[PDB]
Design a binder for this molecule. Structure first.
Ligand code: 20Y
Ligand code: CA
Ligand code: NA
Ligand code: ZN
Length: 368
């Protein structure tokens, strides 16, 4: 039936600025929050302010040297760390900005706090839209991500769960998460993503894991222009087969909104309803679920997406007419919650979708 939802948000998040022209806008988390508050969704869920995750918490995955660097680097001392910046991939796509470490701490704190709450059986779902930074690696920033809150939250879940399922609907391959768990069967990682000379360049369907983790990494490579129909063709069948074969006891769902139609960086054509169908599918399995944010560069659509997916988590129907809010002008000219797909060509034929699905089903037969 209906579930208990705990939601994590820190009002300071929207103030972190990656710099002039950088497409990552933490302000989108505040727009999301303000919109869902204006729909009255706070009446149906517990709202918590995450703690600032410490260096002890972050070094459960990341190296001491990389976390020490992130704690130290500032725009004022940048000149003195030119060598370290190159070593850790900080300074270009992953810039040094005021309060960078605090931004890492808040984004991470919500995911780890959500995992603790699920481990304690105090909630059915935990939501952290400021999380989902799937590209960060053990000792390296990547793709605007510095600290991998997802890996840390999964490590927290593994204290009480033998098997954790990770599902990733961001347009990009969930490389940092897949890499962290590549050689274990205790986490199965399932990523659906644009593939073919696209960032980060990994996630071929032939990448299936290694050693004990062989068959525990699943990749569904897609072409430009995927629509609700095509995505819906394959998501429920793959997740259903994964649930059947893997039998996880907890799930982490990365809800990156860069897979929506009209994304500034992305090349997919999903609506908010098509993207949210993924949350509905996963929610149906009735397992402890951690829902996380991710990419998303057309900020008005990110706020619509995560507001609607919070409503889905709550089994709460909300009107398409947007309520007034602090960012009302961002939603023009329509001022509606739902979006239309564009006329872009879907390069993913129905045969291609079915064929990749069949190849993944062959791999899933290899589980015990
Ligand atoms: C050349 C090129 O295309 N570069 C590039 C573009 C987009 C992304 C991205 O979408 N990154 C991301 C960031 C986050 C972050 C969330 C919060 C802070 S960063 C979460 C998920 C993804 N996929 C990464 C790299
Ligand atoms: Ca993905
Ligand atoms: Na794995
Ligand atoms: Zn992305």
């Amino acid at each position: 039936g209906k579930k208990k939802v705990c939601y994590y948000y820190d009002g300071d998040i929207g103030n972190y600025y990656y710099g002039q022209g950088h497409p990552m806008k933490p302000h989108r988390i505040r727009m999301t929050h303000n919109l869902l508050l204006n729909y009255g969704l706070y009446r149906k869920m517990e709202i918590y302010r995450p703690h600032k995750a410490t260096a002890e918490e972050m070094t459960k995955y990341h190296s001491d040297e990389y976390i020490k660097f992130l704690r130290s680097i500032r725009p004022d001392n940048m000149s003195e760390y030119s060598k370290q910046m190159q070593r850790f991939n900080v300074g270009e796509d992953c810039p040094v900005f005021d309060g960078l470490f605090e931004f890492c701490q808040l984004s991470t704190g919500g995911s780890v706090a959500g995992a603790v709450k699920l481990n304690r059986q105090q909630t059915d779902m935990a939501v952290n839209w400021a999380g989902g930074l799937h590209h960060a690696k053990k000792s390296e920033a990547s793709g605007f991500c510095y600290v991998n809150d997802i890996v840390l939250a999964i490590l927290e879940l593994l204290k009480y769960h033998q098997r954790v399922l990770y599902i990733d609907i961001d347009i990009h391959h969930g490389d940092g998460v897949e890499e962290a768990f590549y050689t274990t069967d205790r986490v199965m990682t399932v990523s659906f993503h644009k593939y073919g000379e696209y960032f980060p360049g990994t996630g071929d369907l032939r990448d299936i894991g290694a050693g004990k983790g062989k068959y525990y990494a699943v990749n569904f490579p897609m072409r430009d222009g995927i629509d609700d129909e095509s995505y819906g063709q394959i998501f429920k069948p793959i997740i259903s087969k994964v649930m059947e074969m893997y039998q996880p006891s907890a799930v982490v769902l990365q809800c990156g909104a860069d897979s929506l139609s009209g994304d500034r960086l992305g090349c997919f054509n999903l609506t908010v309803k098509g993207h949210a169908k993924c949350v509905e599918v996963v929610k149906t399995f009735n397992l402890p679920l951690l829902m996380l944010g991710g990419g998303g560069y057309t900020i008005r659509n990110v706020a619509r997406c995560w507001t609607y997916e919070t409503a889905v988590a709550l089994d709460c129907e909300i009107p398409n007419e947007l309520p007034y809010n602090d960012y009302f002008e961002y939603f023009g000219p329509d001022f509606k919650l739902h979006i239309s797909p564009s006329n872009m060509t879907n390069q993913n034929t129905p045969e291609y979708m079915e064929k990749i699905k069949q190849r993944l089903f062959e791999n899933l037969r290899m589980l015990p």
